[PDB]
Amino acid sequence: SAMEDFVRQCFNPMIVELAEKAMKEYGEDPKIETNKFAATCTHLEVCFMYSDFGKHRFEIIEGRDRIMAWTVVNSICNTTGVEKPKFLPDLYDYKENRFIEIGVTRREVHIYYLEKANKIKSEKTHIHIFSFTGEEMATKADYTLDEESRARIKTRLFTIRQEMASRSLWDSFRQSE
Numbered sequence: 484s485a486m487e488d489f490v491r492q493c494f495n496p497m498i499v500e501l502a503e504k505a506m507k508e509y510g511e512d513p514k515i516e517t518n519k520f521a522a523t524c525t526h527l528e529v530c531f532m533y534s535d536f537g538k539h540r541f542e543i544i545e546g547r548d549r550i551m552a553w554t555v556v557n558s559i560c561n562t563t564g565v566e567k568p569k570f571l572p573d574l575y576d577y578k579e580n581r582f583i584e585i586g587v588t589r590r591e592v593h594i595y596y597l598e599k600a601n602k603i604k605s606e607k608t609h610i611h612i613f614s615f616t617g618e619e620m621a622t623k624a625d626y627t628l629d630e631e632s633r634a635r636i637k638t639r640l641f642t643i644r645q646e647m648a649s650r651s652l653w654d655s656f657r658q659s660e
């Protein structure tokens with residue numbers, strides 16, 4: 484399909500391999516579940532960009548194998564005393580000393596924020612939701628990053644959406660969330 488071609492042209496090889504790895508784990512084929520494949524790559528890219536905007540302020544948890552992800556979380560919990568999350572989060576903020584859950588949505592940021600908060604129920608893990616429309620929602624409206632870094636993320640996401648549009652893939656994608 485066009486979707487795999489788009490994914491391999493707009494995402495970096497590492498991200499693509501990571502996303503394919505995740506999918507091969509669940510039991511899903513990136514050539515059938517093409518919209519899921521794109522969402523995994525998009526969310527991975529956002530996580531990595533978030534981390535790279537940080538002396539390293541953020542520890543990346545997402546994109547690691549579960550064994551290693553929970554090793555990182557456990558080490559952080561034992562050195563900081565911060566409580567252990569029930570679900571693997573996406574980053575850890577050493578400056579603000581808190582785990583962060585990153586959401587990327589094709590819907591309205593508030594619907595997805597409510598969904599993530601209801602899902603985690605761990606009042607400690609900070610939530611940051613980004614849209615493909617340049618909108619964001621974050622716990623206590625603490626957006627953590629500076630304006631330019633958040634702007635770079637927003638620009639990239641809008642750019643992915645428009646690349647999908649030029650290829651007639653956006654409509655399927657936004658209805659597949």
Ligand SMILES: O=C(O)c1[nH]c(-c2ccc(-c3nnn[nH]3)cc2C(F)(F)F)cc(=O)c1O
Pocket residue numbers: 518519521522523524526545571572573585586587659660
């Ligand atoms: O495993 C994680 O840690 C994780 N998993 C997801 C996630 C869940 C379902 C789909 C899906 N799309 N279509 N059908 N199912 C896609 C994603 C994706 F964003 F990863 F792509 C979201 C997170 O935010 C997160 O942190």
Ligand SMILES: [Mn+2]
Pocket residue numbers: 545571572573
């Ligand atoms: Mn995650």
Ligand SMILES: [Mn+2]
Pocket residue numbers: 526573584585586
């Ligand atoms: Mn996430």
